[PDB]
């Protein structure tokens, strides 16, 4: 439910905000 997934690893964030933060952390 509201699964914002990181196109770099298996990570689905509940918030789109969280996704943005994660993606900019998920540089590796
Ligand atoms: Zn990621």
Curated annotation (Swiss-Prot):
Post-translational modification: Neddylated by TRIM40, resulting in stabilization of NFKBIA and down-regulation of NF-kappa-B activity.
Annotated spans, Interaction with CYLD: 3-28
Residue(s) of cross-link: Glycyl lysine isopeptide (Lys-Gly) (interchain with G-Cter in ubiquitin): 8
Organs and tissues of expression: Heart, brain, placenta, lung, liver, skeletal muscle, kidney and pancreas.
Zn finger residue spans: CCHC NOA-type: 3-28
Consequence recorded when altering residue 16 to V: In IP; impairs binding to ubiquitin
Binding-site residues, Zn(2+): 6, 9, 22, 26
Protein's cellular compartments: Cytoplasm; Nucleus
Entry text on domains: The leucine-zipper domain and the CCHC NOA-type zinc-fingers constitute the UBAN region and are essential for polyubiquitin binding and for the activation of IRF3.
Oligomer status and interactors: Homodimer; disulfide-linked. Component of the I-kappa-B-kinase (IKK) core complex consisting of CHUK, IKBKB and IKBKG; probably four alpha/CHUK-beta/IKBKB dimers are associated with four gamma/IKBKG subunits. The IKK core complex seems to associate with regulatory or adapter proteins to form a IKK-signalosome holo-complex. The IKK complex associates with TERF2IP/RAP1, leading to promote IKK-mediated phosphorylation of RELA/p65. Part of a complex composed of NCOA2, NCOA3, CHUK/IKKA, IKBKB, IKBKG and CREBBP. Interacts with COPS3, CYLD, NALP2, TRPC4AP and PIDD1. (Microbial infection) Interacts with Molluscum contagiosum virus protein MC005; this interaction inhibits NF-kappa-B activation.
Function recorded in the entry: Regulatory subunit of the IKK core complex which phosphorylates inhibitors of NF-kappa-B thus leading to the dissociation of the inhibitor/NF-kappa-B complex and ultimately the degradation of the inhibitor. Its binding to scaffolding polyubiquitin plays a key role in IKK activation by multiple signaling receptor pathways. Can recognize and bind both 'Lys-63'-linked and linear polyubiquitin upon cell stimulation, with a much higher affinity for linear polyubiquitin. Could be implicated in NF-kappa-B-mediated protection from cytokine toxicity. Essential for viral activation of IRF3.
Annotated disease: Ectodermal dysplasia and immunodeficiency 1: A form of ectoderma dysplasia, a heterogeneous group of disorders due to abnormal development of two or more ectodermal structures. EDAID1 is an X-linked recessive disorder characterized by absence of sweat glands, sparse scalp hair, rare conical teeth and immunological abnormalities resulting in severe infectious diseases. Severely affected individuals may also show lymphedema, osteopetrosis, and, rarely, hematologic abnormalities. The phenotype is highly variable, and may be fatal in childhood. Immunodeficiency 33: An X-linked recessive disorder characterized by variably impaired immunologic function and early-onset recurrent infections, usually due to pneumococcus, H.influenzae, and atypical mycobacteria. Features of hypohidrotic ectodermal dysplasia are generally not present, although some patients may have conical teeth or hypodontia.
Name the record gives this protein: NF-kappa-B essential modulator
Species this chain originates from: Homo sapiens
Gene from which the chain derives: IKBKG
Full protein stretch here: 394 to 419 of 419
